[PDB]
Amino acid sequence: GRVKIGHYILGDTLGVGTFGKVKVGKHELTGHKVAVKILNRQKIRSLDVVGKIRREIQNLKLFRHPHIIKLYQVISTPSDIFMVMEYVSGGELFDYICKNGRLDEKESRRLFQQILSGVDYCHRHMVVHRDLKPENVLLDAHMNAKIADFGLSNMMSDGEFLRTSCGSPNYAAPEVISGRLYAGPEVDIWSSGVILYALLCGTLPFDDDHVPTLFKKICDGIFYTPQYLNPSVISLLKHMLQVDPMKRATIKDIREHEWFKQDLPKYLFKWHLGIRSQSRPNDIMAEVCRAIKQLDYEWKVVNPYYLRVRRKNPVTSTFSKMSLQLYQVDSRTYLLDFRSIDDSHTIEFFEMCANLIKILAQ
Amino acid sequence: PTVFRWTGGGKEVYLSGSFNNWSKLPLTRDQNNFVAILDLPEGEHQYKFFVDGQWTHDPSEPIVTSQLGTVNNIIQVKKTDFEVFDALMVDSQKAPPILPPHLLQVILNKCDPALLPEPNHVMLNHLYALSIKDGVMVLSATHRYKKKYVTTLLYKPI
Amino acid sequence: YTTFMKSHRCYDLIPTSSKLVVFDTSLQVKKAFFALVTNGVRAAPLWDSKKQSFVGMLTITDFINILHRYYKSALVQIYELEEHKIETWREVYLQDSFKPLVCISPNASLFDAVSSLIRNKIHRLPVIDPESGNTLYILTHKRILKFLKLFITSLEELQIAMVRTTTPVYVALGIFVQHRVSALPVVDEKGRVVDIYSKFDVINLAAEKTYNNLDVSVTKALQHRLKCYLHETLEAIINRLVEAEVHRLVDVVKGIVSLSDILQALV
Ligand SMILES: Nc1ncnc2c1ncn2[C@@H]1O[C@H](COP(=O)(O)O)[C@@H](O)[C@H]1O
Ligand SMILES: N#Cc1c(O)c2c(-c3ccc(Br)cc3)c(Br)sc2[nH]c1=O
Numbered sequence: 001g002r003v004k005i006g007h008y009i010l011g012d013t014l015g016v017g018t019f020g021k022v023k024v025g026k027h028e029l030t031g032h033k034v035a036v037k038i039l040n041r042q043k044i045r046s047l048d049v050v051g052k053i054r055r056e057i058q059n060l061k062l063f064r065h066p067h068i069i070k071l072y073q074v075i076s077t078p079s080d081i082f083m084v085m086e087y088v089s090g091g092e093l094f095d096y097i098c099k100n101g102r103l104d105e106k107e108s109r110r111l112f113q114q115i116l117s118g119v120d121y122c123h124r125h126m127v128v129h130r131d132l133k134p135e136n137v138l139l140d141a142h143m144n145a146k147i148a149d150f151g152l153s154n155m156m157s158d159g160e161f162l163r164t165s166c167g168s169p170n171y172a173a174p175e176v177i178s179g180r181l182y183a184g185p186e187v188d189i190w191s192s193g194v195i196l197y198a199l200l201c202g203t204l205p206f207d208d209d210h211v212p213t214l215f216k217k218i219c220d221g222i223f224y225t226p227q228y229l230n231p232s233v234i235s236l237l238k239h240m241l242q243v244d245p246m247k248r249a250t251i252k253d254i255r256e257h258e259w260f261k262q263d264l265p266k267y268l269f270k271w272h273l274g275i276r277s278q279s280r281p282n283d284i285m286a287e288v289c290r291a292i293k294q295l296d297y298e299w300k301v302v303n304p305y306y307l308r309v310r311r312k313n314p315v316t317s318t319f320s321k322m323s324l325q326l327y328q329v330d331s332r333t334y335l336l337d338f339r340s341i342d343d344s345h346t347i348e349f350f351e352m353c354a355n356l357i358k359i360l361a362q
Numbered sequence: 363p364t365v366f367r368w369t370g371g372g373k374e375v376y377l378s379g380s381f382n383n384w385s386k387l388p389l390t391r392d393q394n395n396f397v398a399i400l401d402l403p404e405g406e407h408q409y410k411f412f413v414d415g416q417w418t419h420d421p422s423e424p425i426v427t428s429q430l431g432t433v434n435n436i437i438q439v440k441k442t443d444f445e446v447f448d449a450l451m452v453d454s455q456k457a458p459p460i461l462p463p464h465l466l467q468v469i470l471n472k473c474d475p476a477l478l479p480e481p482n483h484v485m486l487n488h489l490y491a492l493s494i495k496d497g498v499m500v501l502s503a504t505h506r507y508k509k510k511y512v513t514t515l516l517y518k519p520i
Numbered sequence: 521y522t523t524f525m526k527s528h529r530c531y532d533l534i535p536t537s538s539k540l541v542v543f544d545t546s547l548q549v550k551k552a553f554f555a556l557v558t559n560g561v562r563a564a565p566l567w568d569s570k571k572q573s574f575v576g577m578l579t580i581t582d583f584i585n586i587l588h589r590y591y592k593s594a595l596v597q598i599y600e601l602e603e604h605k606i607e608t609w610r611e612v613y614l615q616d617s618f619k620p621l622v623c624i625s626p627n628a629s630l631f632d633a634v635s636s637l638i639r640n641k642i643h644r645l646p647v648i649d650p651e652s653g654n655t656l657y658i659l660t661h662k663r664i665l666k667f668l669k670l671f672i673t674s675l676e677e678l679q680i681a682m683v684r685t686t687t688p689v690y691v692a693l694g695i696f697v698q699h700r701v702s703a704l705p706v707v708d709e710k711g712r713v714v715d716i717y718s719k720f721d722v723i724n725l726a727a728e729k730t731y732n733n734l735d736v737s738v739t740k741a742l743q744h745r746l747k748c749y750l751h752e753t754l755e756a757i758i759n760r761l762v763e764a765e766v767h768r769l770v771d772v773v774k775g776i777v778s779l780s781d782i783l784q785a786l787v
């Protein structure tokens with residue numbers, strides 16, 4: 001007798017995904033087909049990704065968008081965890097584009113709209129699926145996009161940037177291949193931009209076998225626009241494939257763009273940050289402590305440039321916390337940033353900061 | 363349900379256990395993985411493997427040596443193991459970065475003077491300040507209450 | 521109408537993204553009023569760093585009170601204003617007779633918000649979250665009667681403090697103090713009303729930095745820049761008010777109907 005889970009008999013391995021094996025599940029009596037992510041509890045703790053999966057499930061378990069793969073149920077067992085999810089027959093968009101050529105302007109657009117609706121849904125729920133590529137975009141029998149591998153995804157918390165340089169280097173954004181900090185949605189837009197190019201051309205905008213020249217071309221934002229390409233979509237690709245994240249197209253700018261707006265279905269949709277110093281970054285970090293202890297405030301040094309400090313309130317008798325990060329601005333300057341931590345809170349935060357500033361450099 | 367997985371090769375691999383009256387149930391092969399999934403009442407259960415003529419236990423898995431020299435594997439099936447979030451819960455037991463440009467973007471500088479643009483979630487709770495223009499220090503930060511935002515400006519002397 | 525305010529939370533009126541200015545009681549009271557002007561705000565909460573709590577609200581009225589209390593002449597500076605702290609003056613203003621901080625919460629209903637403005641004889645109320653302590657936003661009559669108009673789908677039947685053209689600012693400020701009134705209608709040669717000098721007009725002194733001369737006429741003061749009849753309907757009186765975004769409406773004066781008064785009727 002065949003292996004069951006739910007009442008689904010486990011079939012062929014569809015793929016090997018982010019953290020574990022994905023196999024088909026055909027229902028015992030109905031014949032219904034699901035895709036099953038098999039996560040070994042012991043493997044997922046060897047890589048300390050237990051937190052990541054706890055969260056992934058948490059998000060994916062409530063999302064209900066037509067161009068995102070639904071997480072039907074999570075079956076836990078003593079040894080392994082099973083992620084029962086909707087199955088799509090059409091497979092990889094990658095292989096579609098491989099077998100067939102590039103898509104025509106009309107068809108390309110349809111899919112880009114669907115894909116973007118999904119990307120938009122995620123970001124609207126504080127989820128940024130890093131790893132967006134035609135390899136992770138699946139197709140159903142009726143040629144609908146289905147965003148599929150959230151293993152590499154991450155949450156968007158108020159006040160924080162992400163660091164993990166994740167996903168294929170062709171679809172990866174300049175700030176990702178450069179390993180710089182990012183807000184999140186902008187790395188998904190840059191990925192959606194390369195997807196769009198692939199749909200319209202059947203090739204990658206940024207592609208080279210010489211890895212160093214591939215990484216250069218990505219940061220050079222330079223890609224080729226073939227003669228068949230529509231100038232209106234060219235304007236769009238140019239806006240999405242901006243090396244400056246501050247200059248990069250937004251899900252709104254995209255929605256607003258004329259090539260996108262077309263045939264689009266309804267159902268789819270002087271101040272200073274902190275105090276900047278010039279000493280050697282380790283002198284500045286020494287400077288901060290010979291000032292924090294001087295104020296008698298408890299802390300925890302996370303990184304050599306990140307500290308999580310608490311102040312004991314003498315009046316209200318309630319502890320107030322703030323985190324401190326040191327970045328670099330110029331070739332010649334560094335900057336200490338003060339971020340509030342959630343348990344008047346705000347006024348006490350400014351007070352906690354100010355005292356530290358009067359005894360500190362620019 | 364419980365997962366009984368034998369790892370390594372074999373023409374024929376069977377799971378014999380206490381739960382099945384030591385009958386030989388066959389395991390389905392993937393590659394070098396032979397599995398049978400089956401629910402068993404939370405408590406104690408002993409098993410063994412009949413892999414190509416030889417009876418072995420799983421060395422990596424917990425054993426139990428009997429009074430008669432019988433070495434079978436054992437499985438203590440918990441309630442914690444069945445509920446996902448309780449299971450993941452028990453399962454969980456340089457130089458400076460470059461300043462992201464998102465932080466340099468202020469909602470104050472960029473109608474009603476007490477109305478500001480909606481901010482990027484990323485530049486929330488960060489401290490911003492004005493140059494000390496003779497003994498008075500101005501501090502500011504944007505935060506969110508429910509689905510709404512407030513940019514608090516503190517005028518404090520030094 | 522009365523039930524409407526007893527339901528909706530204060531938070532519903534809080535704007536999507538807004539500004540809020542808070543002065544520490546230890547700030548010099550001149551810089552305090554000057555900051556209001558520059559930040560485009562009519563009122564600001566006052567935090568006591570020693571007491572570690574919001575103790576009050578600095579308003580335009582506080583400026584009118586300081587100016588009138590210590591205006592010597594156009595010849596000599598208001599030394600008092602130029603070098604008093606917010607704490608030093610709130611001590612003077614509220615001596616043996618002290619008024620604590622009156623405020624509302626986001627969760628609390630709009631009825632609890634209108635009744636508090638009246639019951640405490642005030643025009644600005646700060647919405648404060650208790651789970652935080654943080655002041656969120658200063659709710660006002662004009663803000664409440666705005667949303668009370670965005671939902672609606674005789675004056676004599678339903679049912680005075682004045683200044684002349686010649687009247688100097690000092691004198692007007694004095695009337696605002698001993699009467700507890702928001703605006704002051706201006707009378708010409710006869711009992712015919714030509715203008716109206718409000719508490720708001722008083723901040724143009726702080727703005728232009730011209731407060732050290734209150735000897736100037738109300739008209740001369742008003743040089744830096746609307747009425748109704750009794751046979752008109754109460755709803756038409758409401759419609760006209762908000763369409764011009766004003767606080768009150770009064771060719772000879774008989775009575776003045778205000779936003780704080782309409783709110784007293786619809787409660
Ligand atoms: N110029 C004025 N003369 C007399 N009473 C006034 C005047 N302005 C306002 N009031 C009254 O003061 C109270 C509050 O109104 P207001 O300060 O204008 O928002 C109401 O009872 C008004 O009738
Ligand atoms: N690599 C791998 C790997 C697995 O193949 C499995 C399986 C499995 C094996 C064969 C069939 Br047929 C169906 C499912 C289970 Br059940 S748990 C598990 N954990 C792993 O890490």
Ligand SMILES: [Cl-]
Pocket residue numbers: 014015016017
């Ligand atoms: Cl794969």
Ligand SMILES: [Cl-]
Pocket residue numbers: none
């Ligand atoms: Cl089949």
Ligand SMILES: [Cl-]
Pocket residue numbers: 087088089090139140141142
């Ligand atoms: Cl399908």
Ligand SMILES: [Cl-]
Pocket residue numbers: 094097098134198202203204
């Ligand atoms: Cl391709």
Ligand SMILES: [Cl-]
Pocket residue numbers: 368369370420421422
């Ligand atoms: Cl084994």
